[PDB]
């Protein structure tokens, strides 16, 4: 998921209203949906992409 | 262990006391209220905020920022109107609180220490414009220490929003770990705009509408509110061997932070919530199946919903059963308060611990997108719901979140169950008194206990009355009340001084005066209600009537007691056999008993028969030669042939220079008012005589004509009984009866003084107007009728008065009130009774209402919005 | 029980540190500044109060209160202009606390407790024309994970904060914990006005405890300490100063005449109570600090509250006296936490420093018949006991009364320690260029004393406290004089200076066969372990299965030119080289090192065949021997290098002879027979080629051998083979590894014969990776060949020295280390230092100064 997400944050400051997008572009191309409090962690997507996937 | 939470105290938007604070969640009320366009554009508000979209005009407020009674603590009003309106707040709130637990601050054993924290400081754009160094958030809590005497650590903790539950948090490891042995712990929060509202903003923390929802799907933000709230903190092992009222007891606590292991500053964290929660609950001993009620933060915005009901979910994952733990909030009812919200939920969960009820969380229909109820152990409410869990065992707990971090858990166990039939009953009559630094703040409370009384919720009246007497401090403007039941003085208190019950100003009044009484008053049932309830009476009668078993023969408690009601035990006392030694022996056991209450005595008169007493308590000769000498005196003058009595209403030079016969004068007592005495034919020649003069003439009915001019044979043999014992020095300024003045050390030890005592006139008036001059005293009876204190304030005695002990024959019944209403007429005036004797056997504390400040406005009047 | 003090920093007047506030404190200065009408008008001040008949222009001064790092933490050049400077300062002061303990804030495994005051928000006047927020700020910018309180009182703040610190660690709410304050006003050039009957002093000093009291003068400060367990401090090691041993806080509320005058009884309460936590009588206490702040109604009554509370001593005037506002002066929120760093150093040195302004006592005070006396000059310190004891106390404007018992570090016996390594690494490092060049020099002047710190105890310290950062320097000492000189000049350095990398990989170049020499590997055997027990299995064997024994022809042989070519001989040189490569690559590999490709030269293939998995160490190790037997039976032979590329070299090659190896694009060996290569070397006398013979008696890699692999072929065993693990890159072929290319047993006979093309699988290493390489051999011959290339930014370091060096292997394998350590690589330079080191106190980060400063009206 490492180049995926690299390419996805290829398409950082946190604003709470990305957490929508980034919410709904999971679930399509991996159908995961994970949950958004999950996806409320840091403001990273390649190491947050790192940490969230081990 | 356990720190109980013993008293509480507050002032929350829409209700002033915590009495109505759970008169408002169990009504399910909202108290956030909302303005218009005209309270808003004369309360000097800006008209570009006004007129605006999204500008919402609600905020949940309190009502009186503005209102201190400097003159009760010794302020001037300089320095009333050069402080913060949150320093006098809370010490209007740190007093309630320490009256609400039924203590006085100044004068505990131990140490008692103060841990509280201010709001934001807004007062820099209210006094700073036109003055002002001296008052920042470093002393609020040693303001809150000096006028009230605390002698124990005053810190002022100050974390962001969670200051109110890290204060506890501070003040639960001071207790435990011996700093002090007493605290008292919260927070404040008042401002300038009371009267103001908020631009709300799409995407923000503050909700749009107006109101709070708090995990529902409609969440839009919260909306601001102001309060006030402190607690009253004490170990559990030292509030149950006192005995107060314990709301809840405490028994885990933790405080942490989150540490750049978030987003942002400003953003919350999941993993430090999930800790808090498992450290409060391993601490205290407990496993989340029994946490049956949760007090979320709940605050209605956003993100800050899910993460918290995720950080729950996470903490409760030992617990394998289905939706058995409630969940709730507080910010629904009166907003979100900033730095006192950690606090005003803490005195609901510590109040629903206690009662056993969970009140109405509003505004909630559906749960949010991200969250699961029916997946998760909790439920939220809608209405007013009883509470009682499978365990039995009622526990809880409360957490509040500040802005760097802070997680404040706290875990709340019900208060243990007591033993409330094993005590002795209550006692037949107790007295209520009420005490207050001025007369509008009395009669303010006195309207008080009036709605608090003639409710069903209402104490005993043993754990009531040793709140108002222990409890409190005893100021000048004092009242009280003598009664039976609680309902019947409710209405007596609500008539506005229409009413007959006790009144007045105390001064100091350093000394008490003592009246003793002569012969021919005494009833049947008398002196026996306070033989079987007062011990000191008991055993100081008991030993006259056993020394007198021991050397002569006449049996005492038979005829006073025991003897059956007829009209022959009227007349079988009232003979001159009986009469003295029985009358010596109740005289000196009463004296005895008003002793042991805190009377000490100046002046010792008397009258007839009280020289025989009044002397013996000033220790010139023992009990016991007196009881040998009065039974001796009494028998050797009953064998004189028959005489007579007669009353006259002339004056005494009148009645020694217009008799007719040769007539002794028997006795001189007012200025109106003597007696003359002689012979069986003699006296009922001048009588009748005189009562075609039309001068009134009663008699005394009495076989033996006392002090007349045919006792001197008796005197002598007496004398002759004198010379076996012997006497001493007195003690107490006694002045005598037939000289007219004072008493030296030879006056009473000679033995013909009791010789002369029996033939010269005494003469009462002459020895009060010399006690009145030069003593300035109030005089109490002690003698079994109203005779002396009808006669005494028929003098010139200005802005004093007199006081009886017993009741004046008819009501025979009530020598269990009679003197209970002499006690608390005596203490209105300002004397030394203690009114603790008069509680019960083992008294515990209750909530009774507080102090009934005034209230006085202190402003600078904010000359910025004036222009 | 006990709370010991192990690290603390500040910044006071007319200082930077505790160290330059320790030397003004023994040097008995007064650090109060005096101004004038001229360095006071034109900064705003106005003319109404500096024309007053009476303005006292004097005032204590902290430096810079304007200079932020704003780039450091991350914030931002518009977050920084609004942040009151008592943040700014504090979040400094507070990171050079943590690495004076020796430690990092963020990695600690337990948990860390901020506790701090503040003072007046005095700049935030100029943000018109938040007190609960500055022990937040200062545990997530540092990442700080227990209690986070702002614990304030009435002017006893500092001192209450250390005795809620106190509160906390000993029921176990934290684990490591630090305790402060900060005072500081943003003009700093102001007078203060005293009045008649004020507090403040009319001619500008204070006088403690003396006839001419008059007032104080106010300060700025800041400072803060760090707590632990008496417990872990003794088990970890560090330095502690002092162990505090009890504490005590009450106020005297009510019973003061008004608000603000001082009481005798509450400030007897807390001195009792503070002993009789700490099991002392007033007997056992030599220093007493003092309040002193030398006002009329506050000095009778503080010596009654002591005279009282040290009332049971059948002694006269021993105990000591002072007070630090004499030198510095007084403020809020300070000089109790400054009045502690002094006692703190005072107990641990055991000088007590002077006392200023002092001749004659006060009318109201009599000394000689109480236990007190007080000093001027700046005396030494024995108590009659062994022990020395201490005491601090503060007092609060409501009246909080805080007295602090502290006692004496105990004594460790550092004798039974195994003596310091014979070198260390010395590790700087720092996020900037210039918070670089300007932290190498407090390194000098830190140096340029005498009795000086461990040598073991200032690596780990430096590796082990100083955190990692992007550009560092590196320096391999052993006499830390001469380091001093060496890190005085800064561009002219002999160490390894430059930024680091990514560097997760290395790879790893094997050398060849005609470049050793004895007594190598000599250093290392003793000195590491791992070394010695790769040397042991690879020895053992040759002393099990054959006639030799390996580890006397290195380590107990005779040095002489004898048996100094006695190894030139093929028969015993293989397998000895083999297992010198095998213990240092197995040695390189305990320091953390990941391999990414093993390429050889002529043997390396035989070797990174073992360490890849292929071969085991046994079968590996059987047959060298054999071949080496083999190889030596061949009659004769010998070698010519000649400078010409492998274009040009097919030109002049006869029948029997060929290319022996291929290395460089301006490199390649022959080999042939002895006559045959003489014939060609003298035809090639006239082509103008400098040209050398490998000193070698057999030909290798060409035409003369193929009869010595044979008994080879039929010697294999049949042994299992295993397919390979590791990213062998061969040099036969010159590609990549096949999975059964390597493990077929006519590899090793094709690679035998076959020449060595090692130059096209450097450019095919070079092509697929970017990597730095590290030789593996006794010697320098395979570095300057890769050097020698189109390696842009990389480069390639050897492992061993330069041949005839074979006393300075052990300084230089640690010279590549810490020249593989700068670039960035993960070798961890914990295993470095002693047997049980501790910590120490040094210099910390020097954050440079940049200016962020809103504009008042008049300023």
């Known amino acids: 998921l490492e180049q995926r997400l690299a390419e996805i944050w290829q398409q950082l400051g946190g604003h709470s209203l990305l957490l929508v997008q980034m919410q709904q572009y999971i679930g399509q191309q991996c159908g995961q949906h994970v949950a958004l409090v999950d996806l409320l962690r840091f403001t990273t997507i390649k190491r947050l992409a790192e940490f969230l996937l081990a | ?867």
């Open chain 2, 1 to 867: 262990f356990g720190i109980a939470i013993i008293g509480m105290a507050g002032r929350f938007p829409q209700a002033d006391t915590v009495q109505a604070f759970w008169e408002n969640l169990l009504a399910s009320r909202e108290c956030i209220s909302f303005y218009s366009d005209e309270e808003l554009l004369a309360m000097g508000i800006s008209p570009e905020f006004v007129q605006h979209p999204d500008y919402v005009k609600a905020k949940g407020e309190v009502a009186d920022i503005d209102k201190f009674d400097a003159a009760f603590f010794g302020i001037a009003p300089r320095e009333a109107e050069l402080m913060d309106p949150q320093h006098r707040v809370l010490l209007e709130t740190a007093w309630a609180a320490f009256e609400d637990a039924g203590y006085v601050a100044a004068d505990y054993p131990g140490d008692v220490g103060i841990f509280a924290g201010k709001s934001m400081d807004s007062y820099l754009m209210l006094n700073l414009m036109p003055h002002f160094i001296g008052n920042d958030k470093d002393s609020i809590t040693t303001t809150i220490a000096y006028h009230l005497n605390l002698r124990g650590p005053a810190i002022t903790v100050q974390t962001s929003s969670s200051t109110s539950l890290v204060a506890v948090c501070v003040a639960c490891q001071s207790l435990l770990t011996w700093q002090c042995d007493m605290a008292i712990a919260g927070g404040v929060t008042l401002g300038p705009p009371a009267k103001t509202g908020y631009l709300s903003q799409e995407g923000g923390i503050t909700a749009a509408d107006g109101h709070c929802r708090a995990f529902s799907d409609n969440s839009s933000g919260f909306v601001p509110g102001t309060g006030a709230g402190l607690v009253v903190l004490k170990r559990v092992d030292e509030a149950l061997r006192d005995g107060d009222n314990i709301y809840a007891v405490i028994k885990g606590f933790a405080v942490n932070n989150d540490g750049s292991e978030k987003i942002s500053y400003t953003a919350p964290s999941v993993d430090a919530q999930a800790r808090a929660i498992a450290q409060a609950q391993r601490l205290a001993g407990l496993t989340p199946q029994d946490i049956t009620y949760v007090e979320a933060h709940g605050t209605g915005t956003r993100l800050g919903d899910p993460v918290e009901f995720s950080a729950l979910s996470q903490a409760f994952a030992g617990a394998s059963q289905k939706q058995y733990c409630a969940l709730g909030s507080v910010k629904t009812n009166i907003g979100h308060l900033d730095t006192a919200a950690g606090v005003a939920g803490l005195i609901k969960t510590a109040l629903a611990v206690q009662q056993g009820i969970i009140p109405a969380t509003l505004h909630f229909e559906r749960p949010n997108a991200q969250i699961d109820l029916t997946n998760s152990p909790f439920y939220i409410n809608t209405t007013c719901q009883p509470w009682q869990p499978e365990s039995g065992i009622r526990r809880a707990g409360v957490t509040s979140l500040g802005m760097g971090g802070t997680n404040a858990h706290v875990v709340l166990e019900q208060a243990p169950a007591v033993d409330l039939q094993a005590r002795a009953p209550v006692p037949a009559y107790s007295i209520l008194p009420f005490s207050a630094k001025t007369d509008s703040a009395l009669s303010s409370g006195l309207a008080r206990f009036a709605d608090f009384l003639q409710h069903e919720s209402l104490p005993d009246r043993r754990d009531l009355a040793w709140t108002l007497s222990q409890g409190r401090k005893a100021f000048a403007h004092r009242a009280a009340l003598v009664t039976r039941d609680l309902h019947a003085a409710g209405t007596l208190l609500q008539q506005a001084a229409t009413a007959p019950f006790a009144r007045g100003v105390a001064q100091t009044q350093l000394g008490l005066g003592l009246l003793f009484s002569g012969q021919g008053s005494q009833y049947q049932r008398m002196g026996h209600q306070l033989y079987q309830v007062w011990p000191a009476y008991a055993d100081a009668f008991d030993r006259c009537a056993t020394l007198l078993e021991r050397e002569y023969q006449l049996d005492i408690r038979h005829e006073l007691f025991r003897a059956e009601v007829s009209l022959a035990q009227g007349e079988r006392l009232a003979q001159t056999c009986l009469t003295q030694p029985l009358l010596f022996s109740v005289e000196y056991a009463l004296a005895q008993l008003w002793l042991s209450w805190g009377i000490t005595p100046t002046v010792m008169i008397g009258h007839s028969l009280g020289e025989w007493v009044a002397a013996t308590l000033a220790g010139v000769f023992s009990l016991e030669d007196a009881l040998r000498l009065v039974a001796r005196r009494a028998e050797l003058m009953h064998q004189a042939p028959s005489g007579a009595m007669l009353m006259v209403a002339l004056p005494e030079a009148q009645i020694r220079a217009l008799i007719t016969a040769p007539l002794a004068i028997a006795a001189v007592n007012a200025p109106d008012y003597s007696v003359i005495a002689g012979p069986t034919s003699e006296i009922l020649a001048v009588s009748q005589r005189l009562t075609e003069q039309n001068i009134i003439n009663k008699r005394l009915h009495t076989s033996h004509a006392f002090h007349s001019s045919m006792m001197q044979d008796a005197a002598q043999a007496l004398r002759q009984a004198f010379e076996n014992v012997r006497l001493n020095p007195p003690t107490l300024t006694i002045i005598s009866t037939v000289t007219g003045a004072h008493v030296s050390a030879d006056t009473l030890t000679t033995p013909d003084y009791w010789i002369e005592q029996m033939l010269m006139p005494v003469q009462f008036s002459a020895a009060l107007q010399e006690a009145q001059a030069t003593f300035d005293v109030d005089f109490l009876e002690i003698g079994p009728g109203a005779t002396l204190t009808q006669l005494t304030n028929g003098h010139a005695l200005g802005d004093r008065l007199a006081f009886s002990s017993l009741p004046a024959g008819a009501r025979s019944s009530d020598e269990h009130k009679h003197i209970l209403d002499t006690v608390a007429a005596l203490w209105v005036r300002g004397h030394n009774i203690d009114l603790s004797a008069f509680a019960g056997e083992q008294p515990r504390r209750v909530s009774l209402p507080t102090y009934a400040f005034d209230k006085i406005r202190y402003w600078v009047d904010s000359p910025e919005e004036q222009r």
